[PDB]
Amino acid sequence: EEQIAEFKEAFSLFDKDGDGTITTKELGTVMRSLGQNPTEAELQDMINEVDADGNGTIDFPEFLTMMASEEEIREAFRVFDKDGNGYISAAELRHVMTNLGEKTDEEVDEMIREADIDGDGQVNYEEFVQMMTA
C-alpha cells in the first residue's frame, strides 16, 4: 500500500539536497552519522547494486525496488549513548538527533517519554530496540 510513504520519507533523509537522487557522498555521510566507516569503493558497489539505470545515482523508483540486525542497532545505540554508560540522556539525544538531521526540549523530552518504559528519564538499550523494531 501507501507504505511507499515511509520509503519516500526514508529516501528524503538520504536525498538531502532533494534533487531526486541519492549519490555516493550523500550515502556515505548518513552511514557515517550512524557510526560506520564505509570506503569509497563500498559506496559505489552499494549504489550500483541498486542503480539499474547506469547513472551512478539512485532515484526513488529504484530505491523502492531495493526496499522490497542486532549489531547495526547496538551500533546505533553506541552512537546515541555518547559517554557509553548504557543510558541515552536528554543531552545525548539532542546532540545525536541534530547530527542525524534535526534542530527543542519539548521535542526531546517528548521523545524520551515516548520510549521511557521504566520512567527513569533516559533511554536504555531495551527501550531503544522498541523504537527501532516497529
Binding site: 546505533a76 538531521g101 521523545m111
Partner: peptide, 23 residues
C-alpha cells in the same frame, strides 16, 4: 514529527544497503 521514525528509517535503510552489498 516523530524523530524516532526518522532515526529508525535511516538505520534500517543503511542496514538494507549493507545487505544488498553482501548479497
Amino acid at each position: 514529527a516523530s524523530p524516532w521514525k526518522s532515526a529508525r528509517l535511516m538505520v534500517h535503510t543503511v542496514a538494507t544497503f549493507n545487505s544488498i552489498k553482501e548479497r
